[model samples]
Target chain A: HKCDITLQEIIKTLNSLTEQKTLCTELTVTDIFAASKNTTEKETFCRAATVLRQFYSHHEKDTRCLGATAQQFHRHKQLIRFLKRLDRNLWGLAGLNSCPVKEANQSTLENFLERLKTIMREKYSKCSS
Target chain B: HKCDITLQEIIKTLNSLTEQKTLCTELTVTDIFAASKNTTEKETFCRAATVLRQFYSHHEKDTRCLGATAQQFHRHKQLIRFLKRLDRNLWGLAGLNSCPVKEANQSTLENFLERLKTIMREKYSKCSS
Candidate 1:
C-alpha cells in the first residue's frame, strides 16, 4: 500500500533530525521538494532513511563505525512498527535491508538529498501513470 | 619588569582564547580581575598559568591526556620568552612544573578561576605593602 505524500512530507523528514535531540547540524533541505510540491510520508521517509544511512556510512569510513547507521536502521525498524498502527500508508519493503556509500562533503550530501527527491518524484510519477 | 595591568588585561586574556584559533570555549575572565582590576600582567599571567595547569591536571585524571593543557603550556612557555624580549619582569618558577587534580565540573572550574585571581590579588597587595 502506498501513502499519498507531498513536499510537506519532505519538510517533516528534514526537521526530524535538526529540530530534535540529535547531533546539531545547520543543514537545511534544498531538495526539489522546495521548488516543486510532491511526495508521500511513507515513501519520503524511506528515501530519507537511505540518504542518512549513506551520509554517516561515508562519514565513519577511514575512521569507520557501525553505531550511527545502525542507530538509524534501528529507528526505522521501530518506525515500521509505528506505521503499522498509524492511519498512514505502508510499504512491504520494510527498509532495513540496505545501507549507504560516500564520504564527508557538503556537495555530496546535497547531491544525495537531491537524488532522494528524484527517487520520490519518479515513484510518484509512476504511480500516477 | 612587572607590566602594570588592569581589568582590561583580563578581557584581553579572556578574548585571547576565543578571538584566536582555539577549541572555542565560552569561558570568560570572571576572576577578581573583573571586580577590582588591580594587578600586573607579570603576576596575573603567572597565576593564570597555575590555574590552567590545575584545571587540566584534574581534568586529565580520568580521561588521562595532556594535549589540551600541553597546548596551553606551550603557549605560555613561548610567552615567557616573548616576555624576556620585552622588559617585563619574569619568574624562574617557569611554570610547566605542575598540573591539575580533578574532573570536568563547572563549579570546580569557576572555583579554580577565582583561585587564580586570588593568588594574583594577594601577590599584588603584598608588593604594594
Candidate 2:
C-alpha cells in the first residue's frame, strides 16, 4: 500500500525465509547466484537481480563481473535492454568477500537497500498513476 | 606531422625508431611504458599514448589488464578523461609481455596502425573542418 511497491517486493522477496534464518541474514552474493542455477529457485533469483540493478550500480565480485568496468558496462547495457523486455534477474557478481557478511560489506548491502527504499519512495508517487 | 593533428601522426608515432628498430618493431605493451619513465622519452611517450587511445579500444595484456574487464574499462575511462586533457603518453600497462615484441605482438602494433590509418582517412573531413 505504498511507494516503490515493485522495489519493496524485491527486498521482501530476498529476505524471505529459508530454513533457519532469512536470506537477508544468510545471503552472500553466492546465494543470489545459486538461486539462479539452472538447477533451481526461479522467482526468488529474479527479484534480487532486479533490486540490485534497478537501485544500485555496484557489481559484487563474481562471474557477472566479466572482469572490467567497460566490459561490465557493456554487459550491463545488454542486461538493461534485455531486462527491460523480459524483466528481473539476469546476471552474476564476482570478487565480493566471502559469507558471514563483514562490516563494510554489510554496510554496502544495507546502503543499497536504504537507497533503494528512498528512491522507490520518492518516485513511487509519480510512477503509480 | 600530427599528434592528434591528423592522427596519421599516431601511426607514425607507434612506429617511431628506437635502439634496434622502432616501437612498431619491438614494442610490446611494455616499451610504450618504459618510454614514460620519470623516467624518459617525454614527447615520444606522449605520441604513443595518443596513437593507441585515439585508435584502439582493446587494451593489451599486462598491468593494464587489471585482471578484469570492468576494472580495465573503469581504468580505461579514467585514461580517456585524463588523455582528453593531458593526452597520451600517459600511464603504464602491466600484465604485458617482456622484451622485443613477440611475433603476435608485432601483428597487434601493425593492426592498430592499419586501423588507425583507416579511421584517420575516414574522419579526415569532419575533424579538420
Candidate 3:
C-alpha cells in the first residue's frame, strides 16, 4: 500500500505512538543533541527529528506497543521522511551539517511529540481546515 | 469626568492620538528606559508608560493634535492610569521601582501605540466579544 502522508496523519500517528507506554517506562531522551551544540534554529529542529528516530529505533521493545504488522512502523518511517524534508526546507527558511544522532538535550518523549504536533498544527492552520 | 474605561475605548483613544502628526513629527523617543535597565518584566511595561508620557508632556506641540479641551488629553491621562495599574498588577503576574522618564531606547510613537493596542486586543479577546 502506498503511504501518501498529511500533517494531520503525522499527528495522528504520533498520537498512536505516544499513547502507548508499554514499551518504555522512562520518557526522557538524553543525548539527542550529542552530535553538536544546538547553535542554530535548523540544527535545533533537525536534532528533534534525530531524537524521535532514536526513540522508535533504539528501543523497539518500548515501541512494540505499536504492533507487529507495523502499519504504525511504516507511518513512523514516513514521519521521519517528512521531518527530513522539513529539515531541508528549513535551510531556506532558517541548515548545512547532516544531523548526527548521538546523545544530549535531555527532554521528554512527549515533549518532542508535542513540539512536532505544534508545528503540524501551525502548518495545517495556514493551509486547510 | 469619570472615564469609565473599557479596553475598546482605550484602543479608540490611542487611534485618535496617533492619527495626528501636526504637533511633532520625528517619532523616536530615545530615553523612555533612562529610568533604569529594563531588568524585570514590570519595569519594561512601566517604562512604556513613561515613554507615552514624555511624548505628550515634553512635546506638547506635537501632541496638540490631541487638543487643549483634550478629551484626547484626558484619554491620554487615563491611558497612563491604566498603564500604571497594569504595572502594579505585573508585580503579581511578573516588579518594583518606578518607571523613570529620561532618554534612551529609541523607538517610534507608532510602535509604542501598536504594542499597547496589541495588549488591549489580547485582553479583549479573552474577556468578551
Residue B108 error for model 2, in Å? 2.7
Using all chains and alpha carbons, the TM-scores for the candidates as numbered come to: 0.21, 0.18, 0.32
Which model, 1 or 3, shows the larger lDDT?
Answer: 3
> Which 10 consecutive positions of candidate 2 chain A have the poorest summed lDDT?
A31-40
lDDT of 1 by residue, B1-129 (tens): 222454334334433332333221223222212211123334445544554543443343322222258786455344333223221222222222332221122333333333333333443443465
Report the lDDT of model 2 for residue B13.
Answer: 40
Model 2, C-alpha of B95: deviation from truth (Å) = 24
Alpha-carbon error at A2 in model 2, in Å? 39
lDDT of 1 by residue, A72-97 (tens): 54544433332232212212232333
Error of 3 at B54 (Å): 1.9
Better of 1 and 3 by TM-score: 3
* Candidate 3 per-residue C-alpha lDDT over A1-129 given as tens digits, one digit per residue, 9 for 90 to 100: 011244456556555545544324245664332221123435544555556555555655445434455665665455445444543443333233456554423556555554455444444443443
> Candidate 2's residue-wise lDDT over A65-112, tens digit each?
333556545544443333232224122221122222111112233333
Regions more than 4 Å wrong, model 2: A1-129, B1-8, B11-107
The lDDT for every candidate, in the order shown, is 0.34, 0.32, 0.46
Per-residue lDDT of model 3, residues B1-129, tens digit only? 111244456556666545544333345664332221123335544555556555556654345444466565665455445434443443333234475443434556655554455444444443543
Task: State the lDDT of candidate 2 residue by residue for B8-68, as single tens digits.
Answer: 4443443331111222222333222111011112333344454445333444323443334
